Design a protein around this nucleic acid. Sequence first.
RNA 1: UAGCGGCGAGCGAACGGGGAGCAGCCCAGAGCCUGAAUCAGUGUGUGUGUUAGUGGAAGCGUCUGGAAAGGCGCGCGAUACAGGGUGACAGCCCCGUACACAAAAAUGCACAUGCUGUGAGCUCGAUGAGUAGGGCGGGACACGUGGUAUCCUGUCUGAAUAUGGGGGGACCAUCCUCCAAGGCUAAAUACUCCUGACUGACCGAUAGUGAACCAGUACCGUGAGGGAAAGGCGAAAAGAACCCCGGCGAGGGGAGUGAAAAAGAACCUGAAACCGUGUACGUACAAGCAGUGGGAGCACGCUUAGGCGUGUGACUGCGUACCUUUUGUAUAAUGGGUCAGCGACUUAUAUUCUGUAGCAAGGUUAACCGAAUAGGGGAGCCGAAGGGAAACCGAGUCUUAACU
Lengths: 15, 64, 143, 117, 201
Amino acid sequence: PRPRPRPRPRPRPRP
Amino acid sequence: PKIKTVRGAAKRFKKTGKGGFKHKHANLRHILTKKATKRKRHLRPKAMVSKGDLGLVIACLPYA
Amino acid sequence: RLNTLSPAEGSKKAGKRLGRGIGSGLGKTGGRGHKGQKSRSGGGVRRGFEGGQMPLYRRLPKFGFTSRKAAITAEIRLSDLAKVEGGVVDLNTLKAANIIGIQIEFAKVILAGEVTTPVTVRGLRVTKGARAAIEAAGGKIEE
Amino acid sequence: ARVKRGVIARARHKKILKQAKGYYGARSRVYRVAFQAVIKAGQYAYRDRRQRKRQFRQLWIARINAAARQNGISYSKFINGLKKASVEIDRKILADIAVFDKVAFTALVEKAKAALA
Amino acid sequence: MELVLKDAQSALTVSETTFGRDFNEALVHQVVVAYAAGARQGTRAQKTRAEVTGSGKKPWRQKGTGRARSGSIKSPIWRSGGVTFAARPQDHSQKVNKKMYRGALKSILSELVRQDRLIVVEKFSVEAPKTKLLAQKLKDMALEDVLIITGELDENLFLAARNLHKVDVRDATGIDPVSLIAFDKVVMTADAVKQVEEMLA
RNA sequence: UAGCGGCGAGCGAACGGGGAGCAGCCCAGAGCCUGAAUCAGUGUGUGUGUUAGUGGAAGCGUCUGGAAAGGCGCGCGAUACAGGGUGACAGCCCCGUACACAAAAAUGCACAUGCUGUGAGCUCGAUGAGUAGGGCGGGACACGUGGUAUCCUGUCUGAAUAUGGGGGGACCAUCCUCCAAGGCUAAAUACUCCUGACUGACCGAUAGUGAACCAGUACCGUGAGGGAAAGGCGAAAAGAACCCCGGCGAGGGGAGUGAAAAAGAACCUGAAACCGUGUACGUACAAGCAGUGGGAGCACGCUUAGGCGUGUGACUGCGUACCUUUUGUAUAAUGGGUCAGCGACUUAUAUUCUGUAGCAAGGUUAACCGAAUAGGGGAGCCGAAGGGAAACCGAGUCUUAACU
């Protein structure tokens, strides 16, 4: 029983 | 294991006859020259612990 | 006969069982309310804590000192003065009836009433009040 | 003393599913859904026990107002005429009187018309 | 206060408070429960999450996975290991005051003479340790389930009552509340009464 | 508790008392006397235990039941109804148990004793030097250097020596007590890899050791390491001869064994989720937490010949799930696919209050002894007197020179 690659993350912003 | 006593409270509170506690007044250590003598005189004798703080000193010291 | 012995009324209370349904009245955090430090398992402030405010055992100044002479000093009531032995009382043999203790070095005779027998006091320190009371029974007081 | 909660839990779920008999889908097989259905049905039973006294009363009023207008009098004047005639026959009996025996309702209408006029 | 025998009717008198006080049911019940509690062995132990044979390794990651948050396979909400508040070998015996224990025994004995279950006799001794002749003895006085209590415990009577289920032989100093209640009848020899009187006082 | 402590958190004695168990000795040295107590090492004798074991009591008839130990009736043993098995629950069916016995050989232990080593008893001495102590820096004493006693140590120093020195909590004087700088020592004390017996208000296979089933096994990881799942036919296999269909299959139906095969090896009991077949009703013009109140019709079950009950239910008013979090949730805020099992305010020790029981100005024991949840044991704890920081005073005490 394996997990998942996890949803590809978006480029995080800043102030 | 028996309850340990808060040694700080033990040196500031003494059990009275009916179960109350006496304590020394504050504002009586260093800066005394700027206070009135009347204010200083009233702080010399010991005073009773108020009913609001009476529950705190019981938990701090159950044995004394 | 062994299956009829019942306890007295009010001797047992069956306890409070927490988290045992709506009807029990002690479910859903069981009598400690909603969120907070007191609601957590193992949560709770220390003794004397007032939330960062200087506590009463730290706001007030310390005073006095402990004298070791008072620890070896006791007081004698007149109720347990005729119980000990015969008609004479001194510093020792009062610990033989267990009214002072072995480590006691000083003793005083206070006026507590109910003194009947003519006891003779030697070595103790009667105040004023039992002194007239012991002499009212006929006993003399010396050192 | 380990207590196995096998017999007690099964009997508790069977009691709920017994009351949920007749429900559609998972509301009569699944304990999780049936228990919600039984509670909701119990809430409706408590609620509709009051509405039954409301729906039937407004049903009898419609029955009386239908037959009274066949005799030539409104419902408002018929009850007022009956009240002035010292008649305490309720709307339950009055609805059943007008349905079965039309002759007796005409005498009641004429009794209320004489008191009103 | 007279204790009449079964055959010779020799009138023995004892102290009033020992066999004639009121039956304090609450006092008796506490001692009976305490006597049963002191006989509890209390040998039991389960395993906490720190005593289950296993690893302290986190099963899966804290985040990322779709599974629930887990930190150890030894958690009580898991299979193969659990029991949060595991039992320990403890002592169930509870303290009984001397005056409370003696006061309860006197109230038990006082109820026994009110229910005529106490039978005082001058002597009780068998010639041989054979259980057949002991079973012959109490059947002639119409007793089947009794507590044989004597002042002096003799091995000749100890052996004869060892196999019979409904009788028990004890020493006068070794009396207990539960056997004075569980057994239907209780029989006194002459000198046991004078020995149980002073031990209760 | 006294104390220690950013005097915060917390740490935490000693004196003394009550108990178990109590055993004192040798060298730093010569002489007299030498084997005298003393232990140690090996043999013998006796007692006793272990490693194999033996004897070991007492009942039938009849009823039901597949089978009886179960019901009934009448007997017996019992220093033996502790326990297990035996076709359902056995004291007399068996293994056993109580009790009474048994060791060719190998040893444990206790003495007596043979031999060897070992060293007695007395007198006179000797009586522990780079040591105590001190300086610097630490460590342990409840004592965190603080007024800090005491001991140990890295380094540097460094006495006296029994007409002398240490300690008695900074330190000085007086008294008390002891003697360092050399060593041995049983008992009360801790634990259980393992063995024997016994017990459990411990579990009954998701529990109990991870493992009741050839489990640290299968399996994963290079490796350290991690780590499962999996019990039950029947009393006895008597576990299905033989026949038929079917692929000399699998599977099934007959027959037979069996109390039972809705006990057939996937085997006691077979719950729910889920999947079906048959029966009764409704449903293809009627919109939504799917229920509830009313309610026609249909199908049955009944006594009555009046009517109830069961199942479905057209139509119709009302009616936007549960939990949590919230000022506020149908909310398009969170959680849950369902079912079965497991899953969370317990335990130990103290202190406070209430109810309740005993005793009562007294109450109560702990450790421990103990034919022992009996009885001793009052060591000790609380209360009966408090005030003051304390000396001290005392039903009064403190403040102050004293208080109206």
